């Protein structure tokens, strides 16, 4: 475990939570994005913002704000990293049905992904020369949908996959982190990831294995999850995988903190942040020399 600092990654999750819920349209969301952008620029990334007015399933007009951060943007060969940074406006799945109208921190559901990819970004800023381009993409408005309407989620990755920030954008492989910080998390093979990126899924999970993270990266089928990686595979043709906390043996599949007031800084395990983080950076190290 040489290249990735989980303490830094953990602090990055605390800092996002500090603004308050990153609910599209609200002030914290505005502030967090500025700080996201500033922070990425401070790590040497060329940071581009893609904003659009998008209407949600229930007619709310959201100020979508996708954040694209680039290293070596001239390079034709590119590695893609993804995470959603918005917070769902409600803990719809709280054990107490009175909480269903109220907000939660989303430290894992949103925070964790940005936090790891923030700490990767910093590591990138200290690389004298790089052989591939790297795009880190923070999608917005992934968690605003409703449950009976599967294409009301991932609106940010929808918009971006149909209208990338570069004409003919392409990347060799995509990695999406979603809820990678909860204590005791289980990362199984997401079906679409396994289907469209078999070499990618194996290469990552074998890296984890070699690094001794097989208590976290389980080499076995998980779920068929609609996530930000799916639109990217359909519309951009990029083979993507989703490192996401899901188990077929959970009450909700996701961990019990999901869309729950318990999704907060108290649920985050630095060791789980380290496993995902140190795996992805290591896989990224050999793939860009
Ligand atoms: Zn969510």
Numbering used by the authors: 41 to 329
What does the paper behind this entry write?
Crystal structures of the enzymes from P. gingivalis (PgQC) and T. forsythia (TfQC) reveal a tertiary structure composed of an eight-stranded β-sheet surrounded by seven α-helices, typical of animal type II QCs.
In contrast, helix α7 of PgQC, which is shifted by half a pitch compared with its HsQC counterpart, is preceded by the short helix α7’. Replacement of the third zinc ligand (HsGlu202) with the shorter PgAsp183 results in a minor rearrangement of the main chain. As a result of a different main chain position of PgTrp193 and resulting side chain orientation, the active site is much deeper than in animal QCs. Access is further restricted by (i) the loop following strand βC formed by residues PgArg128, PgPro129, and PgAsp132 (all conserved in bacteroidal QCs), (ii) the inserted loop following βH immediately prior to PgPhe294 and PgTrp298 (both conserved in all type II QCs and that presumably play a role in substrate binding), as well as (iii) the extended chain between βG and α8 that shows structural variability in TfQC and in mammalian QCs.
